[PDB]
Short mmCIF file of C-alpha atoms (C1' of nucleotides) and ligand atoms in Angstrom, two decimals:
data_model
loop_
_atom_site.label_atom_id
_atom_site.label_comp_id
_atom_site.label_asym_id
_atom_site.label_seq_id
_atom_site.Cartn_x
_atom_site.Cartn_y
_atom_site.Cartn_z
CA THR Z 1 0.00 0.00 0.00
CA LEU Z 2 3.09 2.25 0.00
CA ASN Z 3 1.84 3.53 -3.36
CA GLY Z 4 -1.72 2.30 -3.04
CA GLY Z 5 -3.10 5.51 -4.51
CA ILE Z 6 -1.15 5.17 -7.74
CA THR Z 7 -1.75 1.46 -8.15
CA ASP Z 8 -5.49 1.87 -7.58
CA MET Z 9 -5.48 4.61 -10.21
CA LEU Z 10 -3.72 2.36 -12.68
CA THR Z 11 -6.04 -0.53 -11.90
CA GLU Z 12 -9.07 1.69 -12.50
CA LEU Z 13 -7.53 2.85 -15.76
CA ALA Z 14 -6.83 -0.76 -16.65
CA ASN Z 15 -10.39 -1.79 -15.95
CA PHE Z 16 -11.56 1.10 -18.11
CA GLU Z 17 -9.49 0.01 -21.10
CA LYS Z 18 -10.63 -3.60 -20.84
CA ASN Z 19 -14.34 -3.07 -20.17
CA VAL Z 20 -15.23 0.14 -22.02
CA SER Z 21 -12.48 0.54 -24.64
CA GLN Z 22 -12.20 -3.21 -25.21
CA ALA Z 23 -8.48 -2.56 -25.65
CA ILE Z 24 -6.95 -5.71 -24.10
CA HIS Z 25 -3.33 -4.69 -24.56
CA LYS Z 26 -3.71 -1.34 -22.81
CA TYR Z 27 -5.47 -3.22 -20.04
CA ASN Z 28 -2.46 -5.49 -19.57
CA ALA Z 29 0.04 -2.65 -19.78
CA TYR Z 30 -1.73 -0.80 -16.97
CA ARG Z 31 -1.91 -3.98 -14.90
CA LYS Z 32 1.79 -4.62 -15.49
CA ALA Z 33 2.72 -1.13 -14.31
CA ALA Z 34 0.49 -1.34 -11.24
CA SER Z 35 2.12 -4.65 -10.38
CA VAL Z 36 5.68 -3.40 -10.81
CA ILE Z 37 4.95 -0.22 -8.86
CA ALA Z 38 3.17 -2.26 -6.20
CA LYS Z 39 6.36 -4.24 -5.49
CA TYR Z 40 8.53 -1.09 -5.54
CA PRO Z 41 9.93 -0.72 -1.96
CA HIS Z 42 9.79 3.10 -1.94
CA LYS Z 43 7.02 5.72 -1.69
CA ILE Z 44 7.16 7.13 -5.23
CA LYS Z 45 7.87 10.88 -5.21
CA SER Z 46 7.60 11.50 -8.96
CA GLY Z 47 6.75 10.06 -12.35
CA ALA Z 48 10.40 10.14 -13.38
CA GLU Z 49 11.34 7.84 -10.50
CA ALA Z 50 8.52 5.56 -11.62
CA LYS Z 51 9.44 5.71 -15.30
CA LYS Z 52 12.57 3.90 -14.17
CA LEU Z 53 10.56 0.76 -13.46
CA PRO Z 54 10.01 -1.51 -16.50
CA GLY Z 55 6.48 -1.20 -17.81
CA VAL Z 56 6.08 2.37 -16.65
CA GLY Z 57 6.29 4.64 -19.68
CA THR Z 58 6.04 8.36 -20.37
CA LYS Z 59 2.24 8.43 -20.43
CA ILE Z 60 1.96 6.68 -17.07
CA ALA Z 61 4.78 8.80 -15.69
CA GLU Z 62 2.76 11.95 -16.46
CA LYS Z 63 -0.42 10.59 -14.88
CA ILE Z 64 1.61 9.80 -11.76
CA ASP Z 65 2.75 13.42 -11.49
CA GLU Z 66 -0.81 14.64 -11.94
CA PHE Z 67 -1.97 12.18 -9.30
CA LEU Z 68 0.78 13.21 -6.91
CA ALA Z 69 0.18 16.94 -7.28
CA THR Z 70 -3.62 16.90 -7.05
CA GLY Z 71 -4.34 13.48 -5.59
CA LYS Z 72 -6.44 12.52 -8.60
CA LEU Z 73 -6.66 12.06 -12.36
CA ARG Z 74 -9.03 14.16 -14.47
CA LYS Z 75 -9.25 11.37 -17.04
CA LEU Z 76 -10.71 9.07 -14.39
CA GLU Z 77 -12.81 11.89 -12.89
CA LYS Z 78 -14.49 12.31 -16.27
CA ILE Z 79 -14.81 8.56 -16.87
CA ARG Z 80 -16.64 8.20 -13.55
CA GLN Z 81 -19.15 10.77 -14.81
CA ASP Z 82 -19.92 9.05 -18.09
CA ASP Z 83 -23.15 7.11 -17.46
CA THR Z 84 -22.39 4.72 -20.31
CA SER Z 85 -18.96 3.78 -18.96
CA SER Z 86 -20.34 3.64 -15.44
CA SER Z 87 -23.02 1.26 -16.70
CA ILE Z 88 -20.69 -0.98 -18.69
CA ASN Z 89 -18.20 -1.14 -15.81
CA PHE Z 90 -20.92 -2.16 -13.38
CA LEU Z 91 -22.36 -4.96 -15.53
CA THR Z 92 -18.92 -6.50 -16.10
CA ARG Z 93 -18.88 -7.22 -12.37
CA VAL Z 94 -21.49 -9.96 -12.84
CA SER Z 95 -19.62 -13.22 -13.40
CA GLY Z 96 -20.29 -14.28 -16.97
CA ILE Z 97 -20.92 -10.77 -18.28
CA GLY Z 98 -17.96 -9.55 -20.29
CA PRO Z 99 -17.22 -6.22 -22.00
CA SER Z 100 -19.20 -7.26 -25.07
CA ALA Z 101 -22.44 -8.42 -23.44
CA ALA Z 102 -22.21 -5.44 -21.09
CA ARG Z 103 -22.21 -2.97 -23.97
CA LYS Z 104 -24.96 -4.98 -25.66
CA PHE Z 105 -27.12 -4.91 -22.53
CA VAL Z 106 -26.75 -1.15 -22.15
CA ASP Z 107 -27.90 -0.76 -25.74
CA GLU Z 108 -30.93 -2.86 -24.81
CA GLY Z 109 -31.58 -0.51 -21.90
CA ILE Z 110 -30.49 -3.00 -19.24
CA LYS Z 111 -28.01 -1.16 -17.05
CA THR Z 112 -28.73 -1.84 -13.39
CA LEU Z 113 -29.01 -4.69 -10.89
CA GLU Z 114 -32.78 -4.29 -11.06
CA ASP Z 115 -32.80 -4.48 -14.87
CA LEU Z 116 -30.70 -7.62 -14.78
CA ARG Z 117 -33.08 -9.14 -12.26
CA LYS Z 118 -36.18 -8.33 -14.32
CA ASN Z 119 -34.59 -9.75 -17.48
CA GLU Z 120 -33.14 -12.97 -16.12
CA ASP Z 121 -34.64 -14.74 -19.12
CA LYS Z 122 -32.21 -12.78 -21.30
CA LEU Z 123 -29.11 -14.13 -19.56
CA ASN Z 124 -27.29 -17.40 -20.27
CA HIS Z 125 -26.77 -19.97 -17.50
CA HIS Z 126 -23.47 -18.58 -16.22
CA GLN Z 127 -24.73 -14.98 -16.09
CA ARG Z 128 -27.88 -16.14 -14.31
CA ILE Z 129 -25.71 -17.74 -11.59
CA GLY Z 130 -23.41 -14.71 -11.50
CA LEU Z 131 -26.37 -12.44 -10.87
CA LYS Z 132 -27.75 -14.85 -8.25
CA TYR Z 133 -24.57 -14.49 -6.16
CA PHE Z 134 -23.62 -10.97 -7.28
CA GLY Z 135 -23.07 -9.81 -3.73
CA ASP Z 136 -21.38 -12.96 -2.45
CA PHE Z 137 -18.85 -13.12 -5.29
CA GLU Z 138 -17.72 -9.63 -4.28
CA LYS Z 139 -16.69 -10.91 -0.83
CA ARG Z 140 -13.18 -12.16 0.03
CA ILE Z 141 -12.59 -15.61 1.51
CA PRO Z 142 -10.71 -15.63 4.84
CA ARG Z 143 -7.80 -18.05 4.85
CA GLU Z 144 -9.49 -19.61 7.87
CA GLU Z 145 -12.48 -20.51 5.66
CA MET Z 146 -10.13 -21.63 2.90
CA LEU Z 147 -8.61 -24.14 5.31
CA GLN Z 148 -12.08 -25.43 6.16
CA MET Z 149 -12.96 -25.72 2.46
CA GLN Z 150 -9.65 -27.46 1.69
CA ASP Z 151 -10.47 -30.01 4.35
CA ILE Z 152 -13.83 -30.96 2.84
CA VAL Z 153 -12.50 -31.09 -0.73
CA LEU Z 154 -9.50 -33.25 0.13
CA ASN Z 155 -11.48 -35.56 2.39
CA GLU Z 156 -14.31 -35.94 -0.10
CA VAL Z 157 -11.95 -36.56 -3.00
CA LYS Z 158 -10.18 -39.23 -0.96
CA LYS Z 159 -13.58 -40.86 -0.41
CA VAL Z 160 -14.20 -41.16 -4.14
CA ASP Z 161 -10.80 -42.68 -4.92
CA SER Z 162 -7.82 -42.74 -2.56
CA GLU Z 163 -5.51 -42.32 -5.54
CA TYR Z 164 -6.82 -38.82 -6.27
CA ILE Z 165 -4.47 -35.98 -5.36
CA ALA Z 166 -6.19 -32.63 -4.87
CA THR Z 167 -4.02 -29.56 -4.34
CA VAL Z 168 -5.39 -26.07 -3.56
CA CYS Z 169 -3.40 -23.61 -5.60
CA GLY Z 170 -4.13 -20.03 -6.60
CA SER Z 171 -3.67 -17.24 -4.09
CA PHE Z 172 -4.12 -19.78 -1.29
CA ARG Z 173 -0.93 -21.63 -2.18
CA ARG Z 174 0.82 -18.26 -2.41
CA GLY Z 175 -0.14 -17.83 1.25
CA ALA Z 176 -2.72 -15.05 1.02
CA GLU Z 177 -4.72 -14.28 4.17
CA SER Z 178 -7.72 -13.96 1.88
CA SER Z 179 -8.68 -15.33 -1.54
CA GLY Z 180 -11.09 -14.31 -4.28
CA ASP Z 181 -11.95 -17.98 -4.85
CA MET Z 182 -10.70 -21.53 -4.26
CA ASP Z 183 -8.58 -23.12 -7.00
CA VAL Z 184 -8.06 -26.87 -6.93
CA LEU Z 185 -5.64 -28.89 -9.04
CA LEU Z 186 -6.66 -32.50 -9.46
CA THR Z 187 -4.64 -35.51 -10.60
CA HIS Z 188 -5.28 -39.25 -10.83
CA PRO Z 189 -2.87 -42.00 -11.96
CA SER Z 190 -5.43 -43.10 -14.58
CA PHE Z 191 -5.07 -39.84 -16.47
CA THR Z 192 -1.64 -39.16 -17.95
CA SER Z 193 -0.39 -37.36 -21.07
CA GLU Z 194 -0.11 -40.95 -22.27
CA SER Z 195 -3.68 -42.11 -21.74
CA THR Z 196 -7.05 -41.74 -20.05
CA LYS Z 197 -7.56 -45.18 -18.48
CA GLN Z 198 -10.66 -43.91 -16.64
CA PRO Z 199 -13.54 -41.69 -17.79
CA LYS Z 200 -15.64 -39.31 -15.66
CA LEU Z 201 -12.57 -38.58 -13.54
CA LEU Z 202 -13.54 -34.94 -13.00
CA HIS Z 203 -17.28 -35.67 -13.08
CA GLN Z 204 -17.00 -38.17 -10.22
CA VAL Z 205 -15.42 -35.56 -7.97
CA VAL Z 206 -17.97 -32.90 -8.91
CA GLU Z 207 -20.68 -35.48 -8.24
CA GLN Z 208 -19.38 -36.31 -4.75
CA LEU Z 209 -18.97 -32.63 -3.83
CA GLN Z 210 -22.56 -31.96 -4.91
CA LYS Z 211 -23.91 -34.96 -2.99
CA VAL Z 212 -22.50 -33.47 0.21
CA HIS Z 213 -23.93 -30.09 -0.79
CA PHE Z 214 -20.53 -28.43 -1.00
CA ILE Z 215 -20.82 -27.58 -4.70
CA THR Z 216 -24.13 -25.83 -5.23
CA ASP Z 217 -24.01 -24.53 -8.80
CA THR Z 218 -22.06 -25.03 -12.04
CA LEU Z 219 -20.90 -22.22 -14.30
CA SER Z 220 -19.19 -24.55 -16.81
CA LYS Z 221 -18.08 -28.16 -16.88
CA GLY Z 222 -15.93 -30.16 -19.28
CA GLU Z 223 -13.48 -33.06 -19.20
CA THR Z 224 -10.66 -31.30 -17.36
CA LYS Z 225 -12.04 -27.93 -16.21
CA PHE Z 226 -14.84 -27.17 -13.76
CA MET Z 227 -16.05 -23.69 -12.84
CA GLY Z 228 -18.67 -23.51 -10.14
CA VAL Z 229 -19.98 -22.46 -6.77
CA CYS Z 230 -19.56 -23.87 -3.30
CA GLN Z 231 -20.55 -23.04 0.27
CA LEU Z 232 -19.25 -24.20 3.62
CA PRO Z 233 -21.81 -25.81 5.95
CA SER Z 234 -22.98 -23.73 8.91
CA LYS Z 235 -24.08 -24.82 12.40
CA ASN Z 236 -27.51 -24.57 14.05
CA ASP Z 237 -28.76 -20.97 14.29
CA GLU Z 238 -25.54 -19.81 12.61
CA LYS Z 239 -25.95 -17.51 9.61
CA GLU Z 240 -25.00 -19.25 6.37
CA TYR Z 241 -21.56 -18.70 4.90
CA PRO Z 242 -21.49 -16.72 1.63
CA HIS Z 243 -21.44 -18.64 -1.64
CA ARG Z 244 -17.97 -19.03 -3.14
CA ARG Z 245 -16.45 -19.52 -6.57
CA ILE Z 246 -14.49 -22.72 -7.06
CA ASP Z 247 -12.31 -23.73 -10.01
CA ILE Z 248 -11.18 -27.34 -10.41
CA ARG Z 249 -8.58 -28.38 -12.97
CA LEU Z 250 -7.85 -32.01 -13.80
CA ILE Z 251 -4.34 -32.35 -15.19
CA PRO Z 252 -2.24 -35.31 -16.42
CA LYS Z 253 -0.37 -36.66 -13.40
CA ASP Z 254 2.97 -36.82 -15.20
CA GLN Z 255 2.51 -33.09 -15.88
CA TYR Z 256 1.81 -32.06 -12.28
CA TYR Z 257 4.64 -29.53 -11.85
CA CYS Z 258 3.89 -27.54 -14.98
CA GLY Z 259 0.28 -27.69 -13.89
CA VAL Z 260 0.85 -26.70 -10.29
CA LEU Z 261 3.24 -23.94 -11.38
CA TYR Z 262 0.57 -22.46 -13.66
CA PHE Z 263 -2.32 -22.80 -11.22
CA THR Z 264 -0.34 -21.14 -8.42
CA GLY Z 265 0.16 -17.92 -10.33
CA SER Z 266 -0.16 -15.14 -9.94
CA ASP Z 267 -1.58 -14.51 -13.41
CA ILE Z 268 0.85 -11.61 -13.85
CA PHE Z 269 3.73 -13.75 -12.56
CA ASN Z 270 2.80 -16.37 -15.16
CA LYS Z 271 2.67 -13.65 -17.83
CA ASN Z 272 6.14 -12.37 -16.94
CA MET Z 273 7.64 -15.85 -16.53
CA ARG Z 274 6.14 -17.04 -19.82
CA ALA Z 275 7.28 -13.89 -21.58
CA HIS Z 276 10.80 -14.46 -20.21
CA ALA Z 277 10.82 -18.10 -21.33
CA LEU Z 278 9.95 -17.00 -24.88
CA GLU Z 279 12.86 -14.55 -24.76
CA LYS Z 280 15.00 -17.45 -23.58
CA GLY Z 281 13.59 -19.59 -26.38
CA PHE Z 282 10.97 -21.67 -24.62
CA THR Z 283 7.20 -21.81 -24.38
CA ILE Z 284 5.46 -22.67 -21.14
CA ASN Z 285 1.88 -23.76 -20.62
CA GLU Z 286 0.08 -25.60 -17.80
CA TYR Z 287 1.22 -28.86 -19.34
CA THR Z 288 4.80 -28.48 -20.47
CA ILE Z 289 7.85 -26.38 -21.23
CA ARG Z 290 9.00 -26.87 -24.80
CA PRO Z 291 11.94 -25.36 -26.70
CA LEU Z 292 11.42 -22.93 -29.57
CA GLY Z 293 13.38 -23.62 -32.75
CA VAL Z 294 14.01 -20.68 -35.11
CA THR Z 295 11.05 -21.39 -37.41
CA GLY Z 296 8.74 -20.56 -34.51
CA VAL Z 297 7.42 -24.04 -33.80
CA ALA Z 298 7.47 -25.51 -30.30
CA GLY Z 299 9.56 -28.64 -29.88
CA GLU Z 300 9.19 -31.75 -27.73
CA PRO Z 301 8.43 -31.43 -23.99
CA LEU Z 302 11.58 -31.15 -21.89
CA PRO Z 303 11.75 -33.39 -18.80
CA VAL Z 304 10.47 -31.81 -15.56
CA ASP Z 305 10.65 -33.26 -12.05
CA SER Z 306 9.93 -30.17 -10.02
CA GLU Z 307 8.80 -26.59 -10.31
CA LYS Z 308 12.42 -25.55 -9.85
CA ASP Z 309 13.42 -27.55 -12.92
CA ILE Z 310 11.14 -25.24 -14.84
CA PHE Z 311 12.84 -22.16 -13.40
CA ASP Z 312 16.28 -23.57 -14.23
CA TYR Z 313 15.45 -24.10 -17.93
CA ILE Z 314 14.83 -20.37 -18.27
CA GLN Z 315 17.75 -19.45 -16.01
CA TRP Z 316 15.66 -18.01 -13.20
CA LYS Z 317 16.46 -18.52 -9.52
CA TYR Z 318 13.64 -20.40 -7.84
CA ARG Z 319 10.93 -18.20 -6.36
CA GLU Z 320 8.76 -19.76 -3.65
CA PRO Z 321 4.96 -19.52 -4.08
CA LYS Z 322 4.74 -16.73 -1.48
CA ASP Z 323 6.86 -14.56 -3.78
CA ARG Z 324 4.89 -15.00 -7.01
CA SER Z 325 2.12 -12.60 -6.01
CA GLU Z 326 2.72 -9.99 -8.69
"C1'" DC S 1 9.30 3.04 -36.11
"C1'" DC S 2 6.46 -0.98 -35.52
"C1'" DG S 3 5.53 -5.78 -34.38
"C1'" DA S 4 4.59 -8.18 -30.18
"C1'" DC S 5 2.31 -8.41 -26.09
"C1'" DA S 6 1.02 -15.96 -22.25
"C1'" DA S 7 -1.79 -19.65 -22.77
"C1'" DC S 8 -5.75 -22.24 -22.96
"C1'" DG S 9 -10.83 -24.83 -21.40
"C1'" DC S 10 -15.71 -24.36 -21.94
"C1'" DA S 11 -19.97 -21.98 -23.83
"C1'" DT S 12 -21.86 -20.07 -27.81
"C1'" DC S 13 -22.60 -19.10 -32.32
"C1'" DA S 14 -22.31 -18.93 -37.82
"C1'" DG S 15 -21.63 -21.32 -41.73
"C1'" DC S 16 -21.65 -25.57 -44.39
"C1'" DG P 1 -23.69 -32.71 -36.93
"C1'" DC P 2 -18.64 -30.72 -37.59
"C1'" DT P 3 -15.31 -26.84 -37.34
"C1'" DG P 4 -13.55 -22.58 -36.43
"C1'" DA P 5 -14.14 -17.72 -34.71
"C1'" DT P 6 -15.52 -15.24 -30.54
"C1'" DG P 7 -16.65 -14.29 -25.60
"C1'" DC P 8 -15.39 -15.06 -21.00
"C1'" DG P 9 -12.78 -16.47 -17.56
"C1'" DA P 10 -9.37 -12.86 -14.49
"C1'" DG A 1 0.67 1.77 -23.18
"C1'" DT A 2 5.27 -0.10 -23.12
"C1'" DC A 3 9.05 -2.37 -24.87
"C1'" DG A 4 13.27 -4.10 -27.75
"C1'" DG A 5 15.46 -4.79 -32.03
O1 DUP W 401 -5.41 -14.79 -16.71
C1 DUP W 401 -5.12 -15.70 -15.93
C2 DUP W 401 -5.80 -16.00 -14.71
C3 DUP W 401 -5.33 -16.96 -13.91
N1 DUP W 401 -4.19 -17.68 -14.19
C4 DUP W 401 -3.67 -18.69 -13.25
C5 DUP W 401 -2.77 -18.04 -12.18
C6 DUP W 401 -3.78 -17.80 -11.06
O2 DUP W 401 -3.12 -17.70 -9.81
C7 DUP W 401 -4.62 -19.06 -11.14
C8 DUP W 401 -5.97 -19.06 -10.45
O3 DUP W 401 -6.85 -18.12 -11.06
P1 DUP W 401 -7.62 -17.02 -10.18
O4 DUP W 401 -8.43 -16.21 -11.12
O5 DUP W 401 -8.32 -17.81 -9.13
N2 DUP W 401 -6.44 -16.10 -9.50
P2 DUP W 401 -5.75 -16.18 -8.02
O6 DUP W 401 -6.20 -17.40 -7.30
O7 DUP W 401 -4.30 -15.93 -8.14
O8 DUP W 401 -6.27 -14.99 -7.26
P3 DUP W 401 -7.60 -14.83 -6.55
O9 DUP W 401 -7.33 -14.84 -5.09
O10 DUP W 401 -8.28 -13.64 -7.15
O11 DUP W 401 -8.48 -15.99 -6.86
O12 DUP W 401 -4.76 -19.29 -12.57
C9 DUP W 401 -3.49 -17.47 -15.38
O13 DUP W 401 -2.51 -18.11 -15.69
N3 DUP W 401 -4.01 -16.48 -16.18
MG1 MG W 402 -8.17 -17.99 -7.27
MG1 MG W 403 -9.95 -19.39 -9.72
NA1 NA W 404 10.10 2.52 -17.41
NA1 NA W 405 -17.83 -10.22 -15.65
#
DNA sequence: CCGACAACGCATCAGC
DNA sequence: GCTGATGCGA
DNA sequence: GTCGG
């Protein structure tokens, strides 16, 4: 929070570019700068000092001076006043509503929580669920609750098949005291990059978690990726816990490290690390790390036996999970 | 100056 | 139906 | 919006 004011400003600007402008690259540039400034161990006194950090350019340097002198940014001040932008930005907060459907809804005259509620029939499944838990999905999840959720997931998964290995990644694995959701990496010896000796692997787990009323709704569900909702059980007279987002990713067991690396993030850390690999001549995904031969075609998967092995290939000192929160 | 910007699963749709 | 582009996720 | 060749 040393430079919380500037990073918030950049984040707002980033959200503006992505939601209203539908300018994905500007969005990422602003996020990158906010991230780099956020890890800067000094209270920024000027734009110049900031323009020294990679990702902070001249344009952002100027905004930082304006922000420092007045404590605000006219560009954002105006944006906040534009009803259209204010509308689009609000709708994009509903899980399942992106920058495109948000603009489309505004056109259709649907621009408020009430509107959304009176036109539920005009939303797809995901959006319907997003609206249902609009408030809840805006709440953070205390690590304490994350531990309680981890317990149920791991115990339930063990009950389905003792050979299942469920690992909670995301911000939780990075050690955050609070998470936006629960991310679970799943593996089973029957599913390898070599073969799928058992079907319904993911389904079975989803099934078991629903039977115990942990998973309550499903945003999307395929063979290896589940996106849904869950809620911890409450005691007698106790108010119910809020509904929470839960992502489950089944990955080939022999590809666990590339998978766990990816699912631990952060998303920006993955961006930077993947960008670096490419500069080093490699391509990294949640499955493997392959070399890049001149032509521009990925090669065969290099052998990996740990997350560190991945770091070594790209000549990066190992960074524990707690230090990947960019 | 100007190409590149990380990578990919699932839902949805248009065209054949 | 299939496939491939697009939205969304974050 | 920023960067590197
Ligand atoms: O754009 C993305 C988003 C996520 N990810 C990876 C890293 C991230 O940590 C992980 C889980 O996704 P979440 O959206 O749950 N992010 P995270 O758990 O880090 O933060 P939060 O506490 O918001 O959930 O998936 C990417 O690689 N790219
Ligand atoms: Mg998460
Ligand atoms: Mg998640
Ligand atoms: Na800079
Ligand atoms: Na949204």
